[PDB]
Amino acid sequence: GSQEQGMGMDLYATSPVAKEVWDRADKHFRENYGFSIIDIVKNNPKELTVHFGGPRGKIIRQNYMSMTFETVNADG
Amino acid sequence: LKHLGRTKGNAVLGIFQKYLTGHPKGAAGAWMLNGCLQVLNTGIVPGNRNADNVDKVMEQFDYIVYPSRSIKTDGIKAFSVTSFGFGQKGAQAIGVH
Amino acid sequence: EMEAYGKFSLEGCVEMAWMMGLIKNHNGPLKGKPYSGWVDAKTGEPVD
Amino acid sequence: IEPAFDPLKARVYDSSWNWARQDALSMYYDIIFGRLRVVDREIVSQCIQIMNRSNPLLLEFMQYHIDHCPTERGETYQLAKELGQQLIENCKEVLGKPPVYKDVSIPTGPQTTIDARGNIQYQEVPRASARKFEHYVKQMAEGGPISQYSNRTKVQNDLRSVYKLIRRQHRLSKSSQLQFNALYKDVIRALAMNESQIMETIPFLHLRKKDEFGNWEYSKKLTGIYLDGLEAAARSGLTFQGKHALMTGAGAGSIGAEVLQGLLSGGAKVIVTTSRFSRQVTEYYQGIYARCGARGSQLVVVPFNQGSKQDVEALVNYIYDTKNGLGWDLDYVVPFAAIPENGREIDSIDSKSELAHRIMLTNLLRLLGAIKTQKKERGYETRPAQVILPLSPNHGTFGNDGLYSESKLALETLFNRWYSESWGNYLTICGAVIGWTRGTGLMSANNLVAEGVEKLGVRTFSQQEMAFNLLGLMAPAIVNLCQSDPVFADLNGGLQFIPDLKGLMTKLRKEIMETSAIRQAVIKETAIENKVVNGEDHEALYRRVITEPRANLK
Amino acid sequence: ALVNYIYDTKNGLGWDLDYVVPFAAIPENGREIDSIDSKSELAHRIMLTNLLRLLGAIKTQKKERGYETRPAQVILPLSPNHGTFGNDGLYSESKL
Amino acid sequence: PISQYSNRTKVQNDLRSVYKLIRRQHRLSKSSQLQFNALYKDVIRALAMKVETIPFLHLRKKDEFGNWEYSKKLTGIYLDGLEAAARSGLTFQGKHALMTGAGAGSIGAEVLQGLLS
Numbered sequence: 001g002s003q004e005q006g007m008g009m010d011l012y013a014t015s016p017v018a019k020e021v022w023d024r025a026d027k028h029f030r031e032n033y034g035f036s037i038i039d040i041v042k043n044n045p046k047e048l049t050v051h052f053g054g055p056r057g058k059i060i061r062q063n064y065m066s067m068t069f070e071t072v073n074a075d076g
Numbered sequence: 077l078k079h080l081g082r083t084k085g086n087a088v089l090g091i092f093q094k095y096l097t098g099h100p101k102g103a104a105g106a107w108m109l110n111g112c113l114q115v116l117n118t119g120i121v122p123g124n125r126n127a128d129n130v131d132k133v134m135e136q137f138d139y140i141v142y143p144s145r146s147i148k149t150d151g152i153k154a155f156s157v158t159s160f161g162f163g164q165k166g167a168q169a170i171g172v173h
Numbered sequence: 174e175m176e177a178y179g180k181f182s183l184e185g186c187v188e189m190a191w192m193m194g195l196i197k198n199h200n201g202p203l204k205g206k207p208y209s210g211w212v213d214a215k216t217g218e219p220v221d
Numbered sequence: 222i223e224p225a226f227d228p229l230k231a232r233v234y235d236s237s238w239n240w241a242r243q244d245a246l247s248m249y250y251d252i253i254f255g256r257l258r259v260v261d262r263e264i265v266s267q268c269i270q271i272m273n274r275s276n277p278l279l280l281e282f283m284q285y286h287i288d289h290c291p292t293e294r295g296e297t298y299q300l301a302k303e304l305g306q307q308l309i310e311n312c313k314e315v316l317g318k319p320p321v322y323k324d325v326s327i328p329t330g331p332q333t334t335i336d337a338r339g340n341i342q343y344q345e346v347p348r349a350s351a352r353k354f355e356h357y358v359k360q361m362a363e364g365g366p367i368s369q370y371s372n373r374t375k376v377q378n379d380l381r382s383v384y385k386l387i388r389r390q391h392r393l394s395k396s397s398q399l400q401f402n403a404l405y406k407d408v409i410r411a412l413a414m415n416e417s418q419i420m421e422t423i424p425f426l427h428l429r430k431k432d433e434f435g436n437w438e439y440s441k442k443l444t445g446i447y448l449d450g451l452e453a454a455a456r457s458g459l460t461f462q463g464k465h466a467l468m469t470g471a472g473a474g475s476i477g478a479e480v481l482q483g484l485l486s487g488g489a490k491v492i493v494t495t496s497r498f499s500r501q502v503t504e505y506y507q508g509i510y511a512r513c514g515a516r517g518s519q520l521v522v523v524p525f526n527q528g529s530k531q532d533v534e535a536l537v538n539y540i541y542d543t544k545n546g547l548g549w550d551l552d553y554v555v556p557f558a559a560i561p562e563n564g565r566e567i568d569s570i571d572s573k574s575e576l577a578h579r580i581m582l583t584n585l586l587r588l589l590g591a592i593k594t595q596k597k598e599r600g601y602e603t604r605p606a607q608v609i610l611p612l613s614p615n616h617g618t619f620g621n622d623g624l625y626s627e628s629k630l631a632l633e634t635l636f637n638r639w640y641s642e643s644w645g646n647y648l649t650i651c652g653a654v655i656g657w658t659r660g661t662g663l664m665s666a667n668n669l670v671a672e673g674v675e676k677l678g679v680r681t682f683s684q685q686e687m688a689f690n691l692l693g694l695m696a697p698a699i700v701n702l703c704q705s706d707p708v709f710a711d712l713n714g715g716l717q718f719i720p721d722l723k724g725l726m727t728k729l730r731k732e733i734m735e736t737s738a739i740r741q742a743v744i745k746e747t748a749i750e751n752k753v754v755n756g757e758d759h760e761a762l763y764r765r766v767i768t769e770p771r772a773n774l775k
Numbered sequence: 776a777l778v779n780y781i782y783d784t785k786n787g788l789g790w791d792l793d794y795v796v797p798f799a800a801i802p803e804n805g806r807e808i809d810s811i812d813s814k815s816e817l818a819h820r821i822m823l824t825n826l827l828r829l830l831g832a833i834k835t836q837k838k839e840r841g842y843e844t845r846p847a848q849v850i851l852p853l854s855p856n857h858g859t860f861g862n863d864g865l866y867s868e869s870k871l
Numbered sequence: 872p873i874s875q876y877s878n879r880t881k882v883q884n885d886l887r888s889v890y891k892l893i894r895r896q897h898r899l900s901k902s903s904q905l906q907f908n909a910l911y912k913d914v915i916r917a918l919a920m921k922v923e924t925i926p927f928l929h930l931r932k933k934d935e936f937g938n939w940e941y942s943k944k945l946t947g948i949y950l951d952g953l954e955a956a957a958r959s960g961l962t963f964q965g966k967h968a969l970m971t972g973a974g975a976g977s978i979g980a981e982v983l984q985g986l987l988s
Contacts, residue, residue, distance in 0.1 A: 030600070030602070034603055036600065039600075050603070051601075051603045051604035053602075053603040053704060054603070054605050054649075054704035054705065055705065056602065056603055060603060083285060084281055084285070085282045085284055085286075086282075086285045086286075087242065097176075111176065114177075118177070120177050122176045128232065128234070128503075128507060129232075129233060129235060129236045129507065129510075130236045130239045132235075132236070134239070135238055135239070138278060138281075141239065141242050141243065141246070142239055143243055144240070144243065144507075144511060145247075145511075146177055146178075146179070147243075147247060148250060148254070150250070150253065182772075183770065183772040184773070184774050186772075187772050187774070221769065221771075371936075372918075373917075375913065375917050376914055376917045379910050379914045379917075380910075380914060382910060383907065383911065383914070386903055386907055386910070387893065387907070390899060390900075390903055392898040392899065393893060393896055393898055393899075397892055397893065397896065400892075401889055401893070404885040404886075404888070404889045405889075407877050407881070407882070407885055408877075408882050408886075410875070410876055410877075411876040411878075411881075413876075414875075414876035414925060414941065415876050415923070415925075415940070415941050416934075416940050417941075417942070417943070418878060418879055418923075419879045419918060420879070420917075420919065566831075567827050567830060567831045567834070568834065568835060569831060569835075570831060575824060582868065583811065583816060583819065583865075586808050586811055586865075587808075587811050589808060590807075590808045590809055590810060590811060593809065594809060594810075624824070624827075627823065630871060631869075631871055633857075633871070634857050634858040634863075634867045634868050634871050635858070636858075637857055637858035637867075638858040638867075641858055642808065642809070642861050642862070643861075644807065644809065717936065720935065790967045791967060792969055793966040793968055794967075794968030794970075795968065795969050796968065796969070796970045796971070796972075796973075796979065796982060797971055797972065798970070798971060798977070798978065798979040799971040799972040800972055829971070833969075
């Protein structure tokens with residue numbers, strides 16, 4: 001609820017510590033889910049799309065495919 | 077067209093003679109009326125060549141369709157030449173074959 | 174013609190060419206030998 | 222080299238919806254007047270497009286005009302209402318479903334004819350043995366006698382399956398199997414290193430792969446995958462939905478032009494560059510989009526001049542600018558920018574040639590180069606852009622190229638650069654050696670002889686065909702091959718097997734021009750003979766009096 | 776111009792060429808298609824376009840001067856490595 | 872050792888012992904032994920039915936399909952004069968040559984002195 005655009009980005013620039021955190025995070029997100037949370041935070045997109053391109057791209061959709069979700073039937 | 081009961085899906089071919097002739101400040105309708113009286117007697121509804129790419133806003137308007145090349149039809153029954161002007165001057169005329 | 178067909182017929186050209194003043198009807202001797210019909214307004218010559 | 226690109230001139234075409242209803246209502250009256258018979262493949266083509274832009278609102282507008290159709294007037298009004306309802310139903314089962322490029326035309330060939338009165342003419346006649354494009358794909362993929370499996374290519378593909386057999390049947394000791402490929406490798410190497418001591422067909426359209434010694438030998442494995450999608454294309458159709466592409470050289474009446482309409486029939490957004498930015502050309506493209514613009518598609522025409530370094534690096538930024546640009550990211554790049562340097566040997570590499578070679582090579586590389594860095598900077602990593610490199614079969618086999626071949630051959634260095642330099646991820650290379658393509662209303666020089674050369678058992682292509690072929694490498698199938706490894710695509714009509722083609726055509730060039738010359742010369746001769754013998758008066762008063770049209774203003 | 780110094784009978788040194796050994800070259804080391812700079816374009820003009828024009832000039836000279844039965848041998852410096860190495864930067868493209 | 876290739880002779884003598892060994896082992900269905908024999912015959916046809924190397928310096932000639940394959944015939948003539956050069960020496964008397972790129976300490980520089988001698 002308190003998420004504001006660009007939050008904690010000022011601190012990003014001024015702290016070599018906080019910097020590396022966001023980096024290791026983005027590094028992950030980009031190379032695994034194909035997007036950057038830093039971007040999403042900096043400039044808020046009303047829409048954003050990822051792309052399962054070459055070698056490094058096929059491996060991403062792999063994660064999108066390997067997303068499991070549980071709901072049981074009314075008969076068990 | 078809507079509030080009179082126009083059957084949905086039945087659009088009107090829209091003419092914009094201004095692309096070709098420009099806008100004669102005051103003798104506007106006179107030319108447009110001739111346009112229709114000519115269509116009436118040929119069934120040829122002349123397209124609008126400068127209709128580059130019609131504004132997305134115009135999609136909302138079910139009952140109107142904007143021709144960008146001439147259509148030869150079986151014939152036309154009635155037409156509506158409407159026009160506007162400065163000082164809240166609005167005038168519409170209907171013609172019948 | 175223009176609004177509908179998109180170009181001038183031969184009939185249309187002659188009409189425009191007449192009002193624009195590029196051709197006028199002539200009927201009498203033209204360089205001796207008689208002649209009638211369309212003539213170039215500029216060059217007094219005849220035009221087919 | 223004077224810059225020409227200017228964002229303020231950029232024109233955008235995207236109103237698929239309105240054009241649909243137009244072509245729709247346009248076709249209805251077409252049937253009723255008999256401009257269209259159920260014969261003409263045309264009615265089909267048109268129908269597909271109308272399906273390609275299926276809107277709920279379109280259906281309403283469709284049905285009304287069909288329901289209240291007066292059938293009690295003519296067979297045509299009925300024939301309409303029928304074909305209409307058929308279509309309305311079609312469009313219903315396509316709503317939402319991705320739009321497709323499907324070529325439905327009648328595959329056609331070259332037919333040059335010499336009059337009894339010496340007149341030379343060249344038509345395009347339907348191919349006597351192909352009706353649909355499926356017939357085309359097959360006919361291609363089959364091959365021809367003239368493309369005989371050469372000794373080495375046979376020795377190789379044979380030892381191939383001997384291995385695949387011995388291998389995939391595990392019951393020989395690994396002493397023997399291990400010592401089989403030993404004696405197998407030996408044979409392959411020896412063939413490669415000294416072919417001279419040691420020593421069915423080839424598709425018309427195949428892909429090749431790289432030898433250990435950087436050689437492009439036929440690879441049935443790939444040629445399969447390509448010609449396979451190439452089939453499924455002609456059958457069910459091929460889509461481009463959601464993809465973005467840049468296209469330079471897409472002038473009117475060109476290979477690029479056709480390829481364009483292709484991607485436009487898919488959901489493709491393309492940006493087309495023109496070096497003659499006039500209303501006339503503005504129109505042409507909007508014309509194209511009115512007819513090929515499937516929902517989702519977009520056409521952006523722009524003035525551009527690939528002779529300009531700035532233009533290049535500027536165009537690229539219009540494409541990628543989030544704020545004032547059109548903020549895309551490119552999926553295809555189709556660099557067909559070209560100048561006719563016809564007429565010059567190394568004898569004289571004039572201004573034009575140097576210019577041409579800068580448009581065709583240096584700035585081509587810079588165009589790709591710009592696209593890359595754009596992606597690299599904007600973090601666009603997992604979405605490579607496929608580059609349909611227009612290579613050529615004829616590296617100076619023909620005369621007077623004048624810096625032409627030199628450009629086209631150089632391009633091929635890209636094949637290796639993909640591996641060595643660091644743009645692997647952002648750009649992929651798809652070398653497409655385009656073959657002989659006779660061109661409508663363009664030059665008849667390459668068309669008068671087109672027929673005679675096919676007679677040697679080899680294929681020339683119409684524009685529409687070669688575009689189909691190209692869009693083939695655009696297909697999802699092949700794209701993924703590129704993302705791992707560059708693709709060679711011999712789309713030459715198997716003319717590789719006609720040696721001294723330069724010489725062949727130059728012979729045919731003569732004979733044709735020669736017989737016509739004789740034929741019409743003789744006529745003039747015998748015409749003059751009659752004026753002598755019969756006299757001015759006689760011959761004069763016996764010539765067909767063709768009336769000269771006048772104008773009556775009814 | 777060089778070509779005419781070589782072939783001018785009057786004020787030139789009035790030769791006719793037997794060998795031509797075109798090893799004109801510029802070190803374009805360091806650049807990928809990433810960036811074809813000025814240097815590269817220059818280099819590529821020295822190494823390809825003007826190389827061809829050099830030969831071309833020599834030819835027409837002989838052709839005009841009736842020097843028919845004495846061809847000039849051109850030791851084209853080609854290369855084994857058509858972009859197998861990185862950073863050629865318009866190099867390979869010339870040599871190929 | 873790197874430019875190793877086998878003579879036509881080896882290629883067949885190798886094709887022998889492979890067949891003799893795969894065959895006199897009898898583990899394959901008569902289907903596989905049948906078409907193994909099929910494919911073996913084609914191979915032996917197209918080939919019309921000793922270790923060798925490549926000279927570090929050879930000339931090539933053009934295949935019907937514009938390919939530059941080793942041509943011992945030429946490589947001979949070249950490496951032959953190349954020998955007679957190192958022995959008795961090579962002359963350039965009476966010949967004229969233009970040389971661009973002959974900067975100091977360069978391949979061209981050396982070649983220059985050659986023609987000058």
